[PDB]
Amino acid sequence: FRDCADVYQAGFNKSGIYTIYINNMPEPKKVFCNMDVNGGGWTVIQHREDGSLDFQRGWKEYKMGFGNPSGEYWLGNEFIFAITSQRQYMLRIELMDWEGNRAYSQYDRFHIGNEKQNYRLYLKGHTGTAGKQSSLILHGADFSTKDADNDNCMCKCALMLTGGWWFDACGPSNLNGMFYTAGQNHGKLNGIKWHYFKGPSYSLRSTTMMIRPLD
């Protein structure tokens, strides 16, 4: 049982917390499994909805993960890497604004490099209702944090926008930015953003990043 896809095919069709056994990882891992969207079998790698969890963290916490799979959390890059190294995964991103609208972006192929490659992101095949173009750079960006300046900018994107992300310079997204209750009509530019959906100044209400095998 390497992922929520496995969990699903073994007959567990209810979304919720499961434990999975990831190849090459020393200990099992608790994750949230979304079994509802588009046939289910999704492993959630990040979730936000209320701002209870602080995302202003360093490289090591972003690597190992933080938060609680039952609420807001970040799975951790080391884990995302280990899972997406086992086979070929697709990535889906669920987004909601503060006005009741839900949208998604989806990528046919997703993986990231290992820690020595700064967990560099490579994607292909963007579709969805959250913008005609991808708000995540497809073409290559390392992961960056306040203590690891790996972006494609002369500036320091993590310092400017907060959180850990595959910043470009700094690029059209950051789902790990500041949670703002007043996302809609008020600031700022360091919030939870997805440019091609709601723009650079709109901070979103909830996000879920989740992955599953090509099939």
Q: C-beta of 178: minimal distance to its own copies in Å?
A: 29
Q: Does 149 bind Ca ion (CB under 5 A)?
A: yes
**To which residue do tokens 């997204």 refer?**
173
Can residue 184 be called a binding residue for its own copies (CB under 8 A)? Answer: no
For residues 200 and 178, what is the distance between their CA atoms, to the nearest angstrom?
13
Cβ neighbours of 161 (radius 10 Å): 24
Dist. CA 2–CA 92, nearest whole Å: 18
Closest CB 147 distance from its own copies, rounded Å: 19
**2 lies in the site for its own copies, by CB under 8 A:** no
Q: Is the dihedral of CA 134, 155, 177, 39 positive or negative?
A: positive
Binding residue (CB under 8 A) for its own copies from 54, 66, 98, 113: 113
The answer to whether 147 contacts Ca ion (rule: CB under 5 A) is no
Q: Number of residues interacting with its own copies: please give it, by CB under 8 A.
A: 18
**Based on CB atoms, which residue is closest to its own copies, 90 or 204?**
90
CB of 144 to Ca ion, least distance (A): 7
Sketch the per residue contact string, 64 through 93, with its own copies: x for CB under 8 A, - otherwise: ---------------------xxxx-----
Report the distance separating Cα 117 and Cα 97, nearest Å.
33
Query: Which is closer to its own copies, CB of 49 or CB of 108?
Result: 108
Q: Is the dihedral of CA 60, 41, 139, 137 positive or negative?
A: negative
Q: Is the Cβ–Cβ distance between 114 and 143 less than 8 Å?
A: no
Q: Report which residue's Cβ sits closest to Ca ion.
A: 153
Q: What is the b/e burial string over 11-28, where b = at least 16 CB atoms within 10 angstroms of the residue's CB? A: ebeebeebebebeeeeee
One character per residue 155-174, x = contact with Ca ion (rule: CB under 5 A): -x------------------
117 binds its own copies (CB under 8 A): yes
Judged by DSSP in three states, 82 sits in helix
Residues that bind its own copies (CB under 8 A): 85-88, 109, 111, 113-114, 116-118, 120, 122, 124-125, 138-140
Residues that bind Ca ion (CB under 5 A): 149, 151, 153, 156
